[PDB]
Every structure is written in structure tokens, then in C-alpha cells.
Amino acid sequence: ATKAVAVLKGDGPVQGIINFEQKESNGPVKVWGSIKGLTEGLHGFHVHEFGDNTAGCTSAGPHFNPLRSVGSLGNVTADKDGVADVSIEDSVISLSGDHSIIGRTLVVHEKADDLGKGGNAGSRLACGVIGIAQ
Amino acid sequence: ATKAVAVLKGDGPVQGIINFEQKESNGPVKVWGSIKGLTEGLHGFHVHEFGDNTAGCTSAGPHFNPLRSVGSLGNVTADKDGVADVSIEDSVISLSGDHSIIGRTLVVHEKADDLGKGGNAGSRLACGVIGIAQ
Numbered sequence: 682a683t684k685a686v687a688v689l690k691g692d693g694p695v696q697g698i699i700n701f702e703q704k705e706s707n708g709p710v711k712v713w714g715s716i717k718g719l720t721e722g723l724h725g726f727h728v729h730e731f732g733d734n735t736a737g738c739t740s741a742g743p744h745f746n747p748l749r750s751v752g753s754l755g756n757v758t759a760d761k762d763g764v765a766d767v768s769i770e771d772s773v774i775s776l777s778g779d780h781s782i783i784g785r786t787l788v789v790h791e792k793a794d795d796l797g798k799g800g801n802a803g804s805r806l807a808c809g810v811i812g813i814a815q
Numbered sequence: 816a817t818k819a820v821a822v823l824k825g826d827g828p829v830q831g832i833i834n835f836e837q838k839e840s841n842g843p844v845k846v847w848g849s850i851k852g853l854t855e856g857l858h859g860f861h862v863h864e865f866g867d868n869t870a871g872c873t874s875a876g877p878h879f880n881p882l883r884s885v886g887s888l889g890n891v892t893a894d895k896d897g898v899a900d901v902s903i904e905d906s907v908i909s910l911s912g913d914h915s916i917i918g919r920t921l922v923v924h925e926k927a928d929d930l931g932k933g934g935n936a937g938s939r940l941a942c943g944v945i946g947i948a949q
């Protein structure tokens with residue numbers, strides 16, 4: 682596909698809408714949107730393997746790792762008002778092929794992803810299946 | 816993918832969980848599950864174009880159809896207690912390729928689909944994005 686969207690919903694104040702767009706088949710995917718209701722600071726932002734909402738965020742499974750994982754988008758950053766303004770360009774994920782995240786689940790975490798440099802990401806606050814958008 | 820699921824939800828009492836499984840990459844897709852809260856009788860059952868939940872079932876767009884539409888899955892049948900136990904096999908939709916319904920929306924309608932043989936489907940009661948399942 683060319684465009685997609687994930688509506689992030691959970692049991693709490695955290696919610697948001699994240700859009701995805703990829704023009705070239707093997708080109709980067711632009712990810713942008715906003716999430717609010719967050720504790721100030723960094724929050725793990727990943728694509729988890731299953732777009733299964735039968736138990737909400739709980740049935741999403743582990744990170745998408747077709748074989749950091751392909752689903753690891755890093756962190757989003759919430760300001761003191763609890764809002765994270767998202768704008769990313771990623772060339773590992775795709776909206777088509779073996780790396781397609783279409784039909785999988787976008788998750789924002791309670792904690793930061795230390796990305797392997799914690800010098801020594803918690804629960805899934807809000808999640809959404811990634812669907813093909815207009 | 817080889818398996819998928821959609822959780823149907825809407826404004827009213829109609830709820831359901833529908834599973835999909837496709838053994839061979841180009842083979843038929845088996846659809847099964849249950850839906851409750853429906854009026855006895857036939858109810859249009861289709862895959863709509865977009866897996867966009869930003870505006871309920873309204874943002875799902877039209878019937879999925881790459882060239883009955885590809886997206887039409889016929890009707891489901893609610894029994895006298897409003898339960899539609901679903902069991903369908905379809906060789907036109909797929910879980911990969913140009914006819915993939917992954918990332919799109921499954922919708923159960925208020926009225927029957929006449930399938931072009933009405934002798935001369937209404938509102939969207941519930942819907943859910945179709946996601947990859949384990």
C-alpha cells in the first residue's frame with residue numbers, strides 16, 4: 682500500500698492517531714501524528730507482530746521481527762503537557778512486502794526503550810491495528 | 816499472511832470475532848467465527864477498502880475492489896436469537912497479493928446483500944480492521 686493509519690487507544694488517557702506514507706516500493710516510510718496523555722519524556726514506539734485486538738493491546742504479540750527488530754521504531758518524546766508530536770522517516774519498515782507493517786499493531790509504551798544503551802519498555806498503554814488509508 | 820482476525824464493534828449491540836486462514840498463498844480463504852446482537856435473518860458481509868477507524872465504520876470507505884466486488888463475502892445468517900455462526904470459504908479474496916484484505920475493514924450490515932438478484936445492504940452495524948493473527 683501507499684498510506685496507512687493507526688488509531689492508538691487503550692484503557693487510559695493515552696490516545697493518538699499516527700499516519701504512515703511510503704511512495705517508493707523500496708523507499709522510506711514517513712510516520713507522523715500526535716499522541717497525548719503521556720508522562721513527560723521518552724516512550725517505546727514499536728510495531729508488534731499481530732493486528733489482533735481480541736484482548737486489546739494484550740493480543741498484539743512480540744515485536745515484528747521478520748528476521749533492533751524491524752518493528753522497533755525507537756522512542757517518541759512527550760513534553761510536559763503530555764503530548765508527543767511524531768515525525769519520523771524510517772527505511773527498515775515498509776507498507777508492502779516482507780517488511781510490511783500493514784495489518785500489524787502500533788504500540789506506544791509506558792516506559793522508554795533504552796535502545797540497548799541503558800548503561801546497565803513496560804506496558805502497552807495504547808495500540809492500534811495498522812490499516813490501509815485513503 | 817496465513818491467518819487473520821477482525822473484531823467487529825459498533826454503535827449498537829452487534830459484536831463479533833471473525834477469523835481468516837489461507838493455507839496456500841493463492842488458495843481459498845476460510846472465514847469463521849460468530850457475531851451476536853443482530854436481527855434474525857440475512858446480513859450483508861463485506862470487506863471495505865480502508866482500515867481507517869478514525870470515523871467509526873464511516874471512514875472504511877467503499878467495498879474493496881481491485882480490477883460482485885472482491886470485497887463482497889455474501890451474507891451471514893443470524894438465527895432466532897440474533898447469533899450468526901459464520902462459516903465461509905472464498906477464493907477471490909486473499910490474505911496476500913493484490914486481493915489481500917489485510918489492513919482493510921470487515922463490515923456487517925443492517926440489511927441483506929441481494930447479490931444482484933433482488934428481483935428489480937444498508938447501514939454499517941459493526942466493523943473492524945482485519946489484522947495478521949497467530
Ligand SMILES: [Cu+2]
Pocket residue numbers: 725726727728729744788790802
Ligand atoms: Cu513494543
Ligand SMILES: [Cu+2]
Pocket residue numbers: 859860861862863878922924936
Ligand atoms: Cu458493505
